[PDB]
C-alpha cells in the first residue's frame, strides 16, 4: 500500500540505501573500473599489427634485489612509491605469454586495489582508514585526484547562430567513433548571411568551404531530387524548398560525382597534381574524416548522405525559425571525462608509441636479417612513465590535483569536483552562471570565489556520472522491434515517421514511437536489454527518439510516478528497513522498476513532482500527468553545502561562502593520521558533532570526523573587540581545551649518492671531522644525523644532519620557527634504494587573538580579545558565552539560519536530542522550535537576561544566546609570525 | 513558389521565356526538357509572412506530460472535453503570446487557436 | 578524540560521565534522561556529552608501534 505520512522516513530509508551501496566516490571508482576492465583491452585489440589479451596483477613492488612482493597503499605513501599494478599482454609472431609492457597506477579501493573487499578490521590491520573513500592515485607518494573535465557532447548536431562573421546560422557536429581511435572531427554546415543565402559545408582536411550540394554529389547522389529527398523530407513544404534553391545553383556546374570529388580534393591539405590523385584524396577524406561516427567503410555513403542531409535540414529548421537554437550551457549537451576516459585517452598514445618503437627496433634487426627478439624490443617505460608523468604532473593542465586532506568534507568534496573549461567553448557561452539544468546534478551553492567562480563545480549528492555502455544490444532490439533501417526505406516514408538516433548516429525510423517508448522504458525498468544508465529522450514535436549509451552523461535517481501514484509502495520500505540480513539493497529497488536514473536531457521530457504528499494529491489541478518524483529535494546540494543547517533561510552568497569555509575548518581529517606523514596536518583536540544537523550528514560521515565544536554564542556588543567580524573568546574555555589544535609537519630528505663523488650522507656534522659551513646549532641530532622523536625543536634548529662531500653541509632546518616537538622519525629506502627519512614534528595551537573562526552560516572573523570567565557576561545560571559575536553582522547577511541554529541548538541541548536542520522540512518552523524552548523554562525566542561580568549589573536589553556550531578555520596567526 | 523537377534527369527546372508565343517555360539545363508553366510567377518574397501555426503543430504533442491540459475548451470536431494548450515559441511569431489547443482525444488531434 | 574533562563553558567535570552515559543509553534511557541521571543540568554541560564523538575508540584499532 501507499506511504501517506510515513513519507519523511520512507524518503530517507531510500536515500540511506543509496549511499550504503554506492558511496560518494562511486563515479571515480566506476570510471576507473571501466577503464581497466574494458578500455585497456579494446585498446590493445584495436592496434594494427600481434597482441592477444591483457592481464593485470595486483599492485606489486620489486626491490633492488628483485622479488614480487605486494605493496600496501600505506607503504606506497610512506616510501614515495607509485601504487601501480603490472600489465601483461600476450603477443604472437612463436607465441609469447604475459609479456610485461608497463605499470598502471591503481585508483585506491577500486576493483584492482589490495583494499577492495577488505572489512573494516582488515582495513585497520593495514593501517588504512575505513572511512577513507578511495578514488585517488598514490603517485610518488602523493595522492592525486583526477578532476572530472567537462566538455561538449560529441555526435550531436548543434545549431548556433554566428553573431556576425559571414554565416547567419551554423550547425556543427563533433563526430567520434565508438572506440575513440582517432580524435573527434568537427564538421560545420553554415548558411551565409545577406540569388540567396547559400549553404556551405566546412569539412575537415579542407581549407575552403564547399557548397553543400557538391558534398552531396561527391557522395554519389548526382541528381537533384535525390539530394532534396535527403534534406527535405516533405516536398509539399514550399517554404523550406526555396531556402535550398539558392544552393542547388552554386553547384549547378557540377553534375557528376567525379568532377565533384575533384572540386573537393582541389581544396585539400595536399593538392596533388593528378586529377585521379586529387579524386582519391577527396574520396578518402569523405570516407574517413567526414562524420566518422556514421561509419568508416566503403558503403557508409547513403548513411553519411542521410546524416548530412539531417544536419542541413536542421540548419534550415533553425533558419526558418522552426526550432530553437541550441543552448551551449545546457547540460544535456555536455559530457564529463572522468578517470576512465582521461586515462584511456592517455593510454592510446602510449600504446601507440609502444607499437611504434617495437617496430622501429625489430625492423633494424630483421632487415639486418638476424632475428628480432620482441621481448627486449619492448620499452615498458613508455607506458609506465607516460601514465605516471601525466598523472603526477597534471599536464594531460589542472587535471590531477593533489588530494585535499584538510578535513573529511574537503576530501570528499575534492573527489566529486567538476571543471568547466574556459577554452574556446568558454569564450562563446556563459559558463560561470548557474544554468537551470544543473538542478539536482550540480550543487548550486558550492563554487569557488574570485577568478574561478562558477568554473569549478561539485556534484549534487545523488548525482551519478554514467560510465559508458555498448549500443549493440539496443541496436539489435530496435531492429527486432520493427524499426526500418536507413537503407530499406524510401525518403517518402521518412516524412511522418520518427527518426531514431542511437548515440548520435541516425539509425532508423519508426512509425509508432509511442509504443516504442513504452517498450524501451519497460525494458530499462527491468534491466533486461537496456542497462539502467541508458538515456531515452523523445522529442515529440521534433519527431525523434534519441537513445544514449555514452559515457559522461550525469544523471540522478528519481521515483517513478505511474499516472499519479508512486510505485514505491510500503513493502519496498519495509524490505529496505531490514537492509541487513535481507539482501534488499538499492539495486533491488532499481531492478524493481520503482526508481529510475534520469539524465539532463531525458529530464526535459519528464514532469517531476517535489513531494508525493503534496504534488500528486487531488486539488485545483496544476499538473495531473506527473511522471517522476523527487526522493528528497535536498539531494540537490553538494557535500559541503549539506553541512549548512537551514540553508533555505540563508541568502545564497552565504551558502556559497560557507561551502568554501567548510573546506578550511580543522577537525579530524582521517582516522589514521597517526601513520600518515603528510606535510601540514591540522587535528582538533575535541571535535564535536553538531547539535543541529542535516540528515544528509549521516552519509558524509560528519558525525565521525567532525570539524568544529558547539560553542555557546552570545550575539551582543560587549566591549567593542567584536567590531566587524571579530569575536570575543572565553579565555577560560580556551584554557579548558576549547578549539585547541595540533599541527603536524613532515620533512623528508634522502641520502642520494648521485655522482661518483659528492655523495650526500646523513651524519652528525657539528664539530666531528672535515667540517664546512656548519651554521647555528647541531646538537640534538643523534649520531646517525637524525633527530630523535620526543625532543623539542625550536626556530632555526637542525632536523636532519646531511653533508654533501672537505664536506659541505646541506642539513635540514625547521621551516623558519614554530617550536614543535619531534613526533615521528621514519627511516626507509626510496625506489632507488637510497636511504630516505621522513620526520614529523608536532606543534600545539591554542586559539589566539589572530585566529579565525567561522560559523556554518558563512562569515568568518578573527578573535578580537579573550576575556577570562569572570569577565564574561554571565546568565543567572552562570553560563558565560564561549564566543561573543557582533550583532551588526547578522542582518546584512540574511543568515537567519544562524539564529534558528542557535534556537534549535538550545532546544537540542536541553531536550537531549540532536535537531533536524534539513532544508525543506515543513515539519520544523521557528514557531515549533520556540514553543519547545518555552517548555524548558527559557524565553521562547532564545533571549536571556545576561549580567555584566565586570560590574555585575544586568544588561538592559536581553541578549540572544545559545549553542551554535563553530569551526576553527585553518588560517589562524601562528602561520604568519612563525 | 515551389520547385519543379525535370522528368529525365530529375534536376531542377529553371524558368525561361518563350518568345515565339511569349509564354513562360520551365526548362531543364541538363536536357532539352521544357514545360509550359501554369503559374506565371517566378519568385515570391513574403516579408510580413503571416503564418499559420495551426499547420506546424503536430497532433502528437497531445502525448506530452509536460504540457498543460484543460477542460473548459472542448474540441469542436469530436466534443472531447480535454485539450492541451501551448504557445508558438517560434522566432517569427514569438512576439505574440497566443494559445493553441490540440484536442487530446486519440484519433482526433484537432488543432485550433482561439 | 576523548571526552574532555571539564565542560568548556562552566568547568564542571564531565570527564567521568562518558562511560556512565553509554551505560545508561544501552539500558534504554533516552538521552535527555541519561543526562538528567548524571546530574548535568545546564545545557552547556549537556552538549558536552550530547555532542561528543568518541574517536579514541577508532584510533585503538590500529596496532601500536611496538
Ligand atoms: Zn532535365
Ligand atoms: Zn477532438
Ligand atoms: Zn557546563
Minimum CA–CA partner of A739 in chain C: C8
Residue contact C46–A910, C-beta within 8 A:
yes
Closest CA to A968 of A609, A671, A682, A622: A682
CA of A459 to the centre of ligand 3 (A): 40
A118 alpha carbon, distance to own chain's centre: 25
Q: Which three cell numbers stand for residue A973?
A: 596567526
Pairing state between β A835-845 and A820-829: antiparallel
Neighbours of A954 (CB within 10 A): 13
Residues of chain B with Cβ-Cβ distance to A625 below 8 Å are 65-66, 69
Terminal C-alpha separation, chain B: 30
Residues A830 and A727: beta-carbon distance below 8 Å: no
Residue contact A241–B56, C-beta within 8 A:
no
Of the residues A648, A725, A784, A975, only one is catalytic, namely A725
Closest CA to A837 of A764, A750, A760: A750
Please give, rounded to a whole number of angstroms, the shortest distance from the CA of A895 to a CA of chain C.
23
CATH topology of domain A158-334: 3.90.1110
Residues of chain A with Cβ-Cβ distance to B11 below 8 Å are 223-224, 255
DSSP conformational letter for A400: S
Give residue for cell 584492482.
Answer: A112
Burial A923-940 (b: 16+ CB within 10 A, else e): eeebeebbebbeeeebee
For residues B53 and B73, what is the distance between their CA atoms, to the nearest angstrom?
19
Residues A550 and A503: beta-carbon distance below 8 Å: yes
Mutation target to probe the B interface, by most B beta carbons within 10 A, among A250, A625, A628, A629 is A625
Please give, rounded to a whole number of angstroms, the shortest distance from the CA of C9 to a CA of chain A.
6
Residues A56 and A112: beta-carbon distance below 8 Å: yes
Residues A787 and A839: beta-carbon distance below 8 Å: yes
For residues A654 and A643, what is the distance between their CA atoms, to the nearest angstrom?
13
C-alpha distances out from residue A95 to A42, A86, A90, A91, A383, Å:
20, 20, 8, 6, 22
CB-hemisphere CA count at 13 Å for A465?
33
Of the ligands numbered here, which is closest to the C-alpha atom of C7?
Answer: 3
Residue contact A242–B1, C-beta within 8 A:
yes
Please give, rounded to a whole number of angstroms, the shortest distance from the CA of A525 to a CA of chain B.
19
For residues A749 and A759, what is the distance between their CA atoms, to the nearest angstrom?
14
Contacts of A831 (CB under 8 A, 6+ apart): A79, A80, A81
Residue contact A879–C58, C-beta within 8 A:
no
For residues A555 and A774, what is the distance between their CA atoms, to the nearest angstrom?
62
Pairing state between β A148-152 and A417-419: parallel
Residue contact B2–A241, C-beta within 8 A:
yes
For residues A460 and A661, what is the distance between their CA atoms, to the nearest angstrom?
18
CA of C42 to the centre of ligand 3 (A): 6
Burial A643-652 (b: 16+ CB within 10 A, else e): bbbbbebbbe
B28 labelled ligand-binding: yes
**Torsion of Cα atoms, A106 then A108 then A113 then A119, to 10°:** 180
CA of B81 to the centre of ligand 2 (A): 8
- Hey, which chains touch B, using 3+ CB pairs under 8 Å? A
- Hey, which chains touch A, using 3+ CB pairs under 8 Å? B, C
C-alpha distances out from residue A847 to A145, A971, A972, B104, C6, Å:
32, 11, 8, 70, 18
Burial of residue A368, with CB atoms counted within 10 A of its CB: 0-12 exposed, 13-18 middle, 19 or more buried? exposed
Backbone angle region of A680, left / alpha / beta, with phi > 0 → left and psi within -120 to 50 → alpha:
left
**Torsion of Cα atoms, A458 then A464 then A470 then A471, to 10°:** -100
Residue contact B63–A540, C-beta within 8 A:
yes
Residues A313 and A212: beta-carbon distance below 8 Å: no
Contacts of B46 (CB under 8 A, 6+ apart): none
Which residues are A951's β-sheet partners?
none
Q: Which three cell numbers stand for residue A942?
A: 532564545
Neighbours of A511 (CB within 10 A): 13
Which residues are A499's β-sheet partners?
A509, A544
Minimum CA–CA partner of B29 in chain A: A252
For residues A961 and A947, what is the distance between their CA atoms, to the nearest angstrom?
12
**Torsion of Cα atoms, A385 then A389 then A390 then A393, to 10°:** 180
Of A121, A691, A879, the CB nearest to C42: A879
CA of B13 to the centre of ligand 1 (A): 7
Neighbours of A949 (CB within 10 A): 17
Task: Note the resolution in Å, 1 decimal.
Answer: 2.8
Element (H, E) at C20: helix C18-25
Please give, rounded to a whole number of angstroms, the shortest distance from the CA of A141 to a CA of chain B.
53
Give residue for cell 547559400.
Answer: A198
Which residues are A144's β-sheet partners?
A137, A402
For residues A128 and A765, what is the distance between their CA atoms, to the nearest angstrom?
38
Residue contact A963–C42, C-beta within 8 A:
no
Which phi and psi (to 5°) does residue A603 adopt? -75, 0
Of A672, A869, A910, the CB nearest to C43: A910
Residue contact A909–C61, C-beta within 8 A:
no
Closest CA to A330 of A654, A505, A553, A538: A553
DSSP assignments along A443-505, one per residue? -SS----STTTTTEEEB-SS-EE-----SHHHHHHHHHTT-EESSS--TTTSSSSEEEEETTE
CA of C8 to the centre of ligand 3 (A): 6
A120 labelled catalytic: no
Residues C36 and C24: beta-carbon distance below 8 Å: no
Mutation target to probe the A interface, by most A beta carbons within 10 A, among B56, B89, B91 is B91
Residue contact C50–A738, C-beta within 8 A:
no
Backbone angle region of A643, left / alpha / beta, with phi > 0 → left and psi within -120 to 50 → alpha:
alpha
Which residues in chain A (565-594) have CB-CB distances under 8 A to chain C?
none
- Hey, which chains touch C, using 3+ CB pairs under 8 Å? A
3-state DSSP assignment of residue A555 = strand
Closest CA to A962 of A886, A888, A894, A909: A909
Please give, rounded to a whole number of angstroms, the shortest distance from the CA of B85 to a CA of chain A.
13
For residues B75 and A905, what is the distance between their CA atoms, to the nearest angstrom?
59
Can you give chain B as a three-state secondary structure string?
CCCCECCCCCCEEEEEEECCCCEEEEEECCCCCEEECCCCCCCCCCCCCCCCCCCCCCHHHHHCCCCCEECCCCCCCCCCCCEEEECCCCCCCCCCCCCEEECCCCCCCCEEEC
Please give, rounded to a whole number of angstroms, the shortest distance from the CA of B106 to a CA of chain A.
12
Mutation target to probe the B interface, by most B beta carbons within 10 A, among A168, A224, A607 is A224
B41 labelled ligand-binding: no
Mutation target to probe the B interface, by most B beta carbons within 10 A, among A160, A222, A321 is A321
Of C6, C44, C46, the CB nearest to A912: C46
Technique that determined the structure:
cryo-EM
Residue contact B66–A541, C-beta within 8 A:
no
Burial of residue A343, with CB atoms counted within 10 A of its CB: 0-12 exposed, 13-18 middle, 19 or more buried? buried
CB-hemisphere CA count at 13 Å for A731?
10
Of B30, B56, B57, the CB nearest to A255: B30
Minimum CA–CA partner of C45 in chain A: A909
Minimum CA–CA partner of B64 in chain A: A540
Give residue for cell 593510454.
Answer: A347
Residues of chain A with Cβ-Cβ distance to C54 below 8 Å are none
Which phi and psi (to 5°) does residue A470 adopt? -120, 130
Q: Which three cell numbers stand for residue A478?
A: 530496435
Of A226, A228, A607, the CB nearest to B66: A607
Q: Which three cell numbers stand for residue A332?
A: 544535456
Minimum CA–CA partner of B88 in chain A: A322
Residue contact A690–C51, C-beta within 8 A:
yes
Residues A339 and A28: beta-carbon distance below 8 Å: yes
Minimum CA–CA partner of A321 in chain B: B91
Please give, rounded to a whole number of angstroms, the shortest distance from the CA of B57 to a CA of chain A.
7
Closest CA to A700 of A905, A471, A410: A410
For residues A307 and A492, what is the distance between their CA atoms, to the nearest angstrom?
16
Residues of chain A with Cβ-Cβ distance to B65 below 8 Å are 605-607, 625-627
Provide the edge-to-edge strand list for the sheet that holds A820-829.
A681-684, A741-751, A835-845, A820-829, A792-793
B31 labelled ligand-binding: yes
3-state DSSP assignment of residue A181 = coil
Closest CA to A25 of A642, A700, A694: A700
DSSP conformational letter for A326: P
For residues A323 and B29, what is the distance between their CA atoms, to the nearest angstrom?
35
Amino acid at each position: 500500500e501507499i506511504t501517506p505520512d510515513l513519507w519523511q522516513e520512507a524518503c530517507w530509508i531510500v536515500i540511506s540505501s543509496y549511499f550504503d551501496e554506492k558511496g560518494l566516490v562511486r563515479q571515480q571508482l566506476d570510471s576507473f573500473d571501466e577503464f581497466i576492465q574494458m578500455s585497456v583491452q579494446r585498446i590493445v585489440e584495436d592496434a594494427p599489427p600481434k597482441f592477444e589479451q591483457i592481464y593485470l596483477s595486483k599492485p606489486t613492488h620489486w626491490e633492488r634485489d628483485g622479488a614480487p612482493s605486494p605493496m600496501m597503499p600505506n607503504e606506497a605513501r610512506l616510501r614515495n612509491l607509485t601504487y601501480s599494478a603490472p600489465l601483461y599482454v600476450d603477443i604472437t609472431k612463436t607465441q609469447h605469454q604475459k609479456t610485461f609492457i608497463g605499470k598502471i597506477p591503481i585508483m585506491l579501493r577500486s576493483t584492482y586495489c589490495l583494499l577492495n573487499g577488505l572489512t573494516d578490521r582488515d582495513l585497520c590491520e593495514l593501517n588504512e582508514c575505513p572511512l577513507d573513500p578511495g578514488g585517488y592515485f598514490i603517485i610518488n607518494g602523493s595522492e592525486k585526484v583526477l578532476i572530472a573535465q567537462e566538455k561538449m557532447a560529441t555526435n550531436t548536431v548543434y545549431v548556433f547562430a554566428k553573431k556576425d562573421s559571414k554565416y547567419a546560422y551554423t550547425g556543427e557536429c563533433r563526430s567520434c567513433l565508438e572506440n575513440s581511435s582517432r580524435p573527434t572531427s568537427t564538421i560545420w554546415v553554415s548558411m551565409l548571411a545577406r540569388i540567396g543565402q547559400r549553404i556551405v559545408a566546412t569539412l575537415p582536411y579542407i581549407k575552403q568551404e564547399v557548397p553543400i550540394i557538391i558534398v552531396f554529389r561527391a557522395l554519389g547522389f548526382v541528381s537533384d531530387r535525390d539530394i532534396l529527398e535527403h534534406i527535405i523530407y516533405d516536398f509539399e513544404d514550399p517554404e523550406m524548398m526555396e531556402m535550398v534553391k539558392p544552393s542547388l545553383d552554386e553547384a549547378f556546374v557540377i553534375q557528376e560525382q567525379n568532377v565533384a570529388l575533384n572540386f573537393i580534393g582541389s581544396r585539400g591539405a595536399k593538392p596533388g597534381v593528378t586529377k585521379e590523385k586529387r579524386i582519391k584524396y577527396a574520396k578518402e577524406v569523405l570516407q574517413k574524416e567526414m562524420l566518422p561516427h556514421v561509419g568508416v567503410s566503403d558503403f557508409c555513403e547513403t548513411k553519411k548522405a542521410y546524416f548530412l542531409g539531417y544536419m542541413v535540414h536542421r540548419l534550415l529548421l533553425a533558419a526558418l525559425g522552426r526550432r530553437e537554437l541550441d543552448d551551449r550551457d545546457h547540460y544535456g549537451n555536455k559530457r564529463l571525462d572522468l578517470a576512465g576516459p582521461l586515462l584511456a585517452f592517455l593510454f592510446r598514445g602510449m600504446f601507440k608509441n609502444l607499437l611504434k618503437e617495437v617496430r622501429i627496433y625489430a625492423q633494424k634487426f630483421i632487415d639486418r636479417g638476424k632475428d628480432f627478439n620482441l621481448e627486449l624490443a619492448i620499452k615498458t617505460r613508455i607506458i609506465s612513465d607516460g601514465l605516471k608523468y601525466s598523472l603526477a604532473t597534471g599536464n594531460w593542465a589542472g587535471v590531477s590535483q593533489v588530494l585535499n586532506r584538510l578535513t573529511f568534507a574537503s576530501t570528499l568534496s575534492h573527489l566529486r569536483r567538476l571543471n568547466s573549461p574556459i577554452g574556446r567553448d568558454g569564450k562563446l557561452a556563459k559558463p560561470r552562471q548557474l544554468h537551470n539544468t544543473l538542478w539536482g546534478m550540480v550543487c548550486p551553492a558550492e563554487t569557488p570565489e574570485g577568478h574561478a567562480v562558477g568554473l569549478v563545480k561539485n556534484l549534487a549528492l545523488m548525482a551519478y556520472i554514467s560510465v559508458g555502455s555498448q549500443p549493440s544490444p539496443i541496436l539489435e532490439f530496435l531492429e527486432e522491434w520493427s524499426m526500418e533501417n536507413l537503407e530499406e526505406i524510401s525518403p517518402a516514408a521518412i516524412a511522418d515517421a520518427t527518426k531514431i538516433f542511437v548515440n548520435g548516429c541516425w539509425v532508423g525510423i519508426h512509425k509508432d514511437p509511442e509504443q516504442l517508448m513504452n517498450t524501451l522504458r519497460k525494458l530499462r525498468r527491468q534491466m533486461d536489454i537496456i542497462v539502467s544508465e541508458v538515456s531515452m529522450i523523445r522529442d515529440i514535436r521534433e519527431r525523434e527518439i534519441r537513445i544514449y549509451t555514452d559515457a559522461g552523461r550525469i544523471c540522478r535517481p528519481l521515483l517513478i510516478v505511474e499516472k499519479q501514484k508512486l510505485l514505491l509502495k510500503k513493502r519496498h520500505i519495509d524490505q529496505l528497513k531490514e537492509r541487513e540480513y535481507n539482501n534488499y539493497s538499492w539495486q533491488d529497488l532499481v531492478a524493481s522498476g520503482v526508481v529510475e536514473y534520469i539524465d539532463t536531457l531525458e529530464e526535459e521530457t519528464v514532469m517531476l513532482a517535489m513531494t508525493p504528499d503534496d504534488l500528486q494529491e487531488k486539488e485545483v489541478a496544476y499538473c495531473s500527468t506527473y511522471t517522476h518524483c523527487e526522493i528528497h529535494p535536498s539531494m540537490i546540494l553538494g557535500v559541503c553545502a549539506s553541512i549548512i543547517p537551514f540553508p533555505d533561510h540563508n541568502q545564497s552568497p552565504r551558502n556559497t561562502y560557507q561551502s568554501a569555509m567548510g573546506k578550511q575548518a580543522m577537525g579530524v581529517y582521517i582516522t589514521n593520521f597517526h601513520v600518515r606523514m603528510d606535510t601540514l596536518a591540522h587535528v582538533l583536540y575535541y571535535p564535536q558533532k553538531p547539535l543541529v544537523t542535516t540528515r544528509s550528514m549521516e552519509y558524509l560521515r560528519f558525525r565521525e570526523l567532525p570539524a568544529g565544536i558547539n560553542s555557546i554564542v552570545a550575539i551582543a556588543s560587549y566591549t567593542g573587540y567584536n567590531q566587524e567580524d571579530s569575536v570575543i573568546m572565553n579565555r577560560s574555555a580556551v584554557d579548558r581545551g576549547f578549539f585547541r589544535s595540533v599541527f603536524y609537519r613532515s620533512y623528508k630528505e634522502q641520502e642520494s649518492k648521485k655522482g661518483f663523488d659528492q655523495e650526500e650522507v646523513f651524519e652528525k656534522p657539528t664539530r666531528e671531522t672535515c667540517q664546512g659551513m656548519r651554521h647555528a646549532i647541531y646538537d640534538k641530532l643523534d649520531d646517525d644525523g637524525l633527530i630523535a622523536p620526543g625532543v623539542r625543536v625550536s626556530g632555526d634548529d637542525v632536523i636532519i644532519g646531511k653533508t654533501v662531500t672537505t664536506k659541505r653541509d646541506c642539513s635540514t632546518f625547521l621551516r623558519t620557527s614554530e617550536t614543535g616537538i619531534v613526533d615521528q622519525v621514519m627511516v626507509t629506502l626510496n625506489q632507488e634504494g637510497y636511504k630516505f627519512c621522513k620526520i614529523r614534528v608536532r606543534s600545539v595551537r591554542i586559539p589566539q587573538i589572530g585566529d579565525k573562526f567561522a560559523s556554518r552560516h558563512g562569515q568568518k572573523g578573527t578573535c578580537g580579545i579573550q576575556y577570562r570567565q569572570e569577565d564574561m557576561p554571565f546568565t543567572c545560571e552562570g553560563i558565560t558565552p564561549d564566543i561573543i559575536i557582533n550583532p551588526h553582522a547578522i542582518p546584512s547577511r540574511m543568515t537567519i539560519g544562524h539564529l534558528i541554529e542557535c534556537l534549535q541548538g538550545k532546544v537540542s541541548a536541553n531536550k537531549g536530542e540532536i535537531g533536524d536542520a534539513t532544508p525543506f522540512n515543513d515539519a520544523v518552523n521557528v514557531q515549533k522550535i520556540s514553543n519547545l524552548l518555552s517548555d524548558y523554562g527559557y524565553h521562547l525566542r532564545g533571549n536571556e537576561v545576561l549580567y555584566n561580568g565586570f560590574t555585575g549589573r544586568k544588561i538592559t536589553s536581553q541578549i540572544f544566546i545559545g549553542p551554535t556550531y563553530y569551526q576553527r578555520l585553518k588560517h589562524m596567526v601562528d602561520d604568519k609570525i612563525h | 513558389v515551389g520547385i519543379r523537377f525535370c522528368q529525365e534527369c530529375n534536376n531542377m527546372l529553371y524558368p525561361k521565356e518563350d518568345k515565339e508565343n511569349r509564354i513562360l517555360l520551365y526548362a531543364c539545363r541538363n536536357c532539352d526538357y521544357q514545360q509550359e508553366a501554369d503559374n506565371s510567377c517566378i519568385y515570391v518574397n513574403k516579408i510580413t509572412h503571416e503564418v499559420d501555426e495551426l499547420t506546424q503543430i503536430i497532433a502528437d504533442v497531445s502525448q506530452d506530460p509536460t504540457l498543460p491540459r484543460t477542460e473548459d475548451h472542448p474540441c469542436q470536431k469530436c466534443g472531447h472535453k480535454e485539450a492541451v494548450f501551448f504557445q508558438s515559441h517560434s522566432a517569427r511569431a514569438e512576439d505574440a503570446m497566443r494559445l493553441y489547443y490540440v484536442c487530446t482525444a486519440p484519433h482526433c488531434g484537432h488543432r485550433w487557436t482561439e | 578524540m576523548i571526552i574532555p574533562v571539564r565542560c568548556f563553558t562552566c568547568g564542571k567535570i564531565v570527564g567521568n560521565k562518558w562511560e556512565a552515559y553509554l551505560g545508561l543509553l544501552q539500558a534504554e534511557y533516552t538521552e535527555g534522561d541519561a543526562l538528567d541521571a548524571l546530574g548535568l543540568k545546564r545545557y552547556c554541560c549537556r552538549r558536552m556529552l550530547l555532542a561528543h564523538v568518541d574517536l579514541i575508540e577508532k584510533l585503538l584499532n590500529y596496532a601500536p608501534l611496538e
